[PDB]
Amino acid sequence: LPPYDPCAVFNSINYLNLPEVQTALHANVSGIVEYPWTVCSNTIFDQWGQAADDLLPVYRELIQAGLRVWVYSGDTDSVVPVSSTRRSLAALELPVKTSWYPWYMAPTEREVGGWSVQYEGLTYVTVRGAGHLVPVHRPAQAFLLFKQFLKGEPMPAE
Amino acid sequence: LPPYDPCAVFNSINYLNLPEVQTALHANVSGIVEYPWTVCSNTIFDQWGQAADDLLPVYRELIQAGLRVWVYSGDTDSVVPVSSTRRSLAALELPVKTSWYPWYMAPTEREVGGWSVQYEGLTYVTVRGAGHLVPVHRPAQAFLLFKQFLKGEPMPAE
Amino acid sequence: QQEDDRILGLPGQPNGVAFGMYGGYVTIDDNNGRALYYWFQEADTADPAAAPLVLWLNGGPGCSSIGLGAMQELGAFRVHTNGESLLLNEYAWNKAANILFAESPAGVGFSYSNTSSDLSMGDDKMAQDTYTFLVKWFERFPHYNYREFYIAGESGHFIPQLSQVVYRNRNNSPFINFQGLLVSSGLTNDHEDMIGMFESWWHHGLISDETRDSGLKVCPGTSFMHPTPECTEVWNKALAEQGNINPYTIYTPTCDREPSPYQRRFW
Amino acid sequence: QQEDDRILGLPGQPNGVAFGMYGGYVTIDDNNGRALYYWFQEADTADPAAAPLVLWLNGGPGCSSIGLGAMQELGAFRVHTNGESLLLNEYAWNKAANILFAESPAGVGFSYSNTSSDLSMGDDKMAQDTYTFLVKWFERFPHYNYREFYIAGESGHFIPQLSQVVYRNRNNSPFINFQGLLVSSGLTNDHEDMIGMFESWWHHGLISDETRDSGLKVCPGTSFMHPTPECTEVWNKALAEQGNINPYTIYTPTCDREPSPYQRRFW
Numbered sequence: 127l128p129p130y131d132p133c134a135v136f137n138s139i140n141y142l143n144l145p146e147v148q149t150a151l152h153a154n155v156s157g158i159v160e161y162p163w164t165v166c167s168n169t170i171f172d173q174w175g176q177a178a179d180d181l182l183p184v185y186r187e188l189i190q191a192g193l194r195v196w197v198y199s200g201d202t203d204s205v206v207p208v209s210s211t212r213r214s215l216a217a218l219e220l221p222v223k224t225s226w227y228p229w230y231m232a233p234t235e236r237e238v239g240g241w242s243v244q245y246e247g248l249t250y251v252t253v254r255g256a257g258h259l260v261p262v263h264r265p266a267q268a269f270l271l272f273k274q275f276l277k278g279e280p281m282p283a284e
Numbered sequence: 285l286p287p288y289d290p291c292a293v294f295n296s297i298n299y300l301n302l303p304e305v306q307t308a309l310h311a312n313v314s315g316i317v318e319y320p321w322t323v324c325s326n327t328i329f330d331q332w333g334q335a336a337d338d339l340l341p342v343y344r345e346l347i348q349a350g351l352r353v354w355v356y357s358g359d360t361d362s363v364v365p366v367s368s369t370r371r372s373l374a375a376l377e378l379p380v381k382t383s384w385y386p387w388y389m390a391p392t393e394r395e396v397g398g399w400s401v402q403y404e405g406l407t408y409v410t411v412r413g414a415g416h417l418v419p420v421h422r423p424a425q426a427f428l429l430f431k432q433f434l435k436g437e438p439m440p441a442e
Numbered sequence: 443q444q445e446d447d448r449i450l451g452l453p454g455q456p457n458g459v460a461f462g463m464y465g466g467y468v469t470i471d472d473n474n475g476r477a478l479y480y481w482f483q484e485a486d487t488a489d490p491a492a493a494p495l496v497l498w499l500n501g502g503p504g505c506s507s508i509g510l511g512a513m514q515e516l517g518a519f520r521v522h523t524n525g526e527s528l529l530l531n532e533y534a535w536n537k538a539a540n541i542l543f544a545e546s547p548a549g550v551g552f553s554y555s556n557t558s559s560d561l562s563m564g565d566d567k568m569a570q571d572t573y574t575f576l577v578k579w580f581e582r583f584p585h586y587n588y589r590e591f592y593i594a595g596e597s598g599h600f601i602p603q604l605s606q607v608v609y610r611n612r613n614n615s616p617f618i619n620f621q622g623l624l625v626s627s628g629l630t631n632d633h634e635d636m637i638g639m640f641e642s643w644w645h646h647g648l649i650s651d652e653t654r655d656s657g658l659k660v661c662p663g664t665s666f667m668h669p670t671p672e673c674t675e676v677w678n679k680a681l682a683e684q685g686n687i688n689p690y691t692i693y694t695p696t697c698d699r700e701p702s703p704y705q706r707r708f709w
Numbered sequence: 710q711q712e713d714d715r716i717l718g719l720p721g722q723p724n725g726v727a728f729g730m731y732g733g734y735v736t737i738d739d740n741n742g743r744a745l746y747y748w749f750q751e752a753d754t755a756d757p758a759a760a761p762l763v764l765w766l767n768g769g770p771g772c773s774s775i776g777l778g779a780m781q782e783l784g785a786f787r788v789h790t791n792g793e794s795l796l797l798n799e800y801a802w803n804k805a806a807n808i809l810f811a812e813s814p815a816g817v818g819f820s821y822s823n824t825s826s827d828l829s830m831g832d833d834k835m836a837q838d839t840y841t842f843l844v845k846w847f848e849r850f851p852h853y854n855y856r857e858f859y860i861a862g863e864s865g866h867f868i869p870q871l872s873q874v875v876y877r878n879r880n881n882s883p884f885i886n887f888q889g890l891l892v893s894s895g896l897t898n899d900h901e902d903m904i905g906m907f908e909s910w911w912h913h914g915l916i917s918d919e920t921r922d923s924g925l926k927v928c929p930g931t932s933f934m935h936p937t938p939e940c941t942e943v944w945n946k947a948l949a950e951q952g953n954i955n956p957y958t959i960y961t962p963t964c965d966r967e968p969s970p971y972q973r974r975f976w
């Protein structure tokens with residue numbers, strides 16, 4: 127995978143606005159959308175109306191239904207920081223099943239990939255050295271996290 | 285400068301116990317010290333007696349005498365973290381002369397080098413992305429901080 | 443149905459892709475002319491039919507699942523620095539699952555509405571509209587009915603709210619075999635998340651003691667999408683004290699091309 | 710006296726070094742036979758005589774100013790991976806000043822005492838021993854008398870405490886033209902520093918909620934060098950939760966060669 131580029135957004139904006147790419151993708155059939163493709167839309171953001179103030183009752187319902195619920199953060203993000211999510215999740219008041227512990231890429235490995243807590247009904251994971259967009263900073267660790275989630279199995283302790 | 289090596293301690297242990305090096309340095313004349321050269325001594329650490337619990341009265345006597353007093357931290361260190369020094373220095377209750385601000389290598393430069401507060405009598409500086417041993421991680425930034433200290437000039441604002 | 447949406451090849455595609463791809467539009471409202479665009483990357487595994495199905499969504503509100511999720515984060519390809527060639531991502535998540543990327547709501551990326559009042563959205567309407575995309579995609583792709591299904595993504599609102607609507611409607615759409623949800627980097631409760639932001643920024647050396655003290659006194663309780671002017675005043679000092687760092691990854695280098703594509707603080 | 714201390718050249722030394730170097734022992738107790746080793750790198754400047762004089766000290770207590778200060782951090786040379794030859798450091802601090810490294814107290818590095826009981830030290834005896842060193846170093850190097858002088862280094866105790874003994878004796882030793890001090894990463898007040906440690910570790914995701922609340926309840930007040938059993942029990946759980954990170958630089962990679970040279974948690 128190439129080294130990190132803080133200007134990489136510009137490459138998919140150029141690529142996704144190429145006419146031949148839109149044809150192959152079956153997107154913007156016959157120029158039907160009049161503005162160009164861009165990554166985020168300011169008008170959807172400025173015009174948003176109802177935004178809930180508390181999703182914790184939605185979480186109690188999903189956990190009551192017996193659904194697998196996992197949440198994770200990158201620890202160098204300051205927009206939604208680790209402290210915000212830890213305080214919100216701690217307010218659900220769930221029983222701890224596996225206490226806060228460091229996880230490794232394999233039980234025999236030495237570099238901490240991040241830390242994790244398992245409550246009864248919910249697993250929380252942090253990824254060390256990763257920003258808001260975790261897979262662009264730590265791709266191997268995000269892939270391991272996705273595989274463990276699909277299995278329903280904890281992140282590897284040593 | 286070569287990139288960061290986590291194992292660089294071992295190169296110094298080896299070079300400083302070479303006999304030709306001890307000769308050129310005029311160190312350990314005639315094999316006068318029994319034990320070999322090492323970076324740190326466990327017997328000095330373990331036999332340490334009297335250790336003060338509060339240095340703030342010493343800071344007040346040096347500031348009152350008009351000596352230049354600067355303090356700095358690396359912000360990825362967890363042994364004496366930025367939070368610990370921030371709280372101890374704040375307990376001096378000095379008036380602020382320049383409020384917390386980001387500093388750059390030059391006023392025209394783009395990347396944040398760290399943050400700084402100037403109180404009446406003491407300047408505090410953090411170096412972004414540097415651990416406890418600040419010059420091994422951010423050498424350029426530590427040289428600039430040294431030069432500003434000698435001039436008695438604040439770290440460059442934008 | 444699906445055959446028309448089959449993507450046979452993409453410009454700048456590297457030489458060995460072996461998994462199937464589909465892309466097109468699903469109309470979710472015939473009267474208003476509202477349609478969502480999706481891109482599907484099948485599992486690059488020996489038996490694709492064994493792998494689960496995963497819906498990925500980015501948030502903001504307002505950002506693209508294809509522009510972030512597929513092309514920069516977890517999809518099979520990344521775009522080269524020449525803006526014309528693709529390269530394979532060895533940690534692509536379709537190595538463990540069939541991944542569906544949808545741009546939602548309409549007005550994001552390639553998704554659109556012929557009635558512009560449709561571009562004024564809200565949380566409950568977003569969840570209803572994306573649930574409707576889902577039941578209509580399953581009708582176009584019936585070989586995924588009853589397959590093990592997960593919802594994943596980067597929005598603390600869209601992923602728990604869509605999950606609640608799928609679950610409440612399970613007797614109406616029994617063929618969605620919903621197993622669980624994976625939430626990344628998201629807002630969860632306004633009061634608790636506002637206290638943790640002012641605290642974490644101070645313990646990382648990003649703000650002053652007095653921005654922290656004022657922020658904790660006037661901002662907890664404010665909405666992030668509809669803020670009071672009292673809290674906007676502290677919030678704005680906080681961000682000025684932080685300087686020119688990228689707030690999404692505070693130790694990395696910043697991009698030099700000045701007309702930035704991100705013009706709002708997308709959450 | 711100083712001419713005998715001149716270092717003519719080091720094994721493995723690079724080709725362009727133009728600055729002067731001196732090294733040797735200064736006996737601070739004739740009776741017990743106690744002596745400190747020093748290495749002096751002069752300013753690499755157009756007129757070194759114009760440049761200030763700075764004493765650099767590392768802390769621990771117990772670690773070496775030459776091993777840490779000079780060879781890995783701010784000195785003119787850096788060691789190659791073969792452990793046998795040197796390279797020039799272009800951000801060396803002797804490009805702006807004359808830098809004096811002393812290993813202190815005796816027992817550290819090359820510094821020794823011929824009376825064994827001298828190796829049990831305390832804060833006041835350290836400041837007195839390094840002040841005596843300084844008075845005696847100036848008589849060997851009489852041309853640095855009254856040069857603009859600064860004390861800098863990595864210990865929250867050694868740098869303020871030696872500065873207080875130099876300052877209170879300025880009418881006794883006026884030739885030490887003491888201008889100020891630079892303190893790096895140091896312990897300053899046991900109570901405030903201890904609250905700051907448990908709070909910073911929690912806000913960086915290193916410890917659990919309950920290690921943080923117990924730590925804040927039993928440890929502020931305790932000494933770092935002589936802790937109560939109550940606080941040691943919490944402290945050891947906290948170091949366990951952090952795992953195998955390097956605690957001096959939490960985001961970098963760890964050294965594989967695990968017979969580590971550092972066997973204590975040096976402050």
Ligand SMILES: *[C@@H]1O[C@H](CO)[C@@H](O[C@@H]2O[C@H](CO)[C@@H](O)[C@H](O)[C@H]2NC(C)=O)[C@H](O[C@H]2O[C@@H](C)[C@@H](O)[C@@H](O)[C@@H]2O)[C@H]1NC(C)=O
Nearest residue numbers: 155156157158469470471472473474475476477554555556
């Ligand atoms: C939004 O409005 C546009 C323009 O009226 C619709 O596209 C046009 O639809 C008419 C009637 O089907 C067709 O004759 C035009 O060729 C078609 N495109 C243009 C440029 O006029 C669009 O819906 C239609 O889009 C076309 C491409 C096709 O897929 C058709 O099946 C579809 O109904 C309207 N969008 C929606 C969601 O209704």
Ligand SMILES: *[C@@H]1O[C@H](CO)[C@@H](O[C@@H]2O[C@H](CO)[C@@H](O)[C@H](O)[C@H]2NC(C)=O)[C@H](O[C@H]2O[C@@H](C)[C@@H](O)[C@@H](O)[C@@H]2O)[C@H]1NC(C)=O
Nearest residue numbers: 313314315316734736737738739741742743744821822823
């Ligand atoms: C610690 O004791 C040793 C051993 O007595 C001292 O070195 C020896 O000193 C005697 C008398 O000066 C001399 O004849 C020996 O040749 C010398 N070295 C050895 C291996 O015995 C040492 O102090 C002395 O160290 C020598 C190298 C020299 O610098 C001399 O000037 C100095 O007095 C004692 N350490 C101290 C700090 O006194």
Ligand SMILES: *[C@@H]1O[C@H](CO)[C@@H](O)[C@H](O)[C@H]1NC(C)=O
Nearest residue numbers: 154157159160161162163551
């Ligand atoms: C759709 O195509 C037209 C040209 O045919 C282009 O100007 C417009 O920007 C495109 N819209 C998108 C979203 O790419």
Ligand SMILES: *[C@@H]1O[C@H](CO)[C@@H](O)[C@H](O)[C@H]1NC(C)=O
Nearest residue numbers: 312315317318319320321818
């Ligand atoms: C001093 O020299 C002796 C004899 O060569 C050696 O064995 C010893 O380890 C040395 N001590 C130091 C501190 O270098």
Ligand SMILES: CCCCCCCCCC(=O)O
Nearest residue numbers: 500501502505596690708709
């Ligand atoms: C410099 C990267 C900025 C990316 C901003 C996008 C955050 C939007 C929410 C999300 O999908 O995560």
Ligand SMILES: CCCCCCCCCC(=O)O
Nearest residue numbers: 767768769772863957975976
């Ligand atoms: C991996 C680096 C560990 C360095 C440990 C020594 C810290 C001692 C005090 C000092 O900074 O002088």
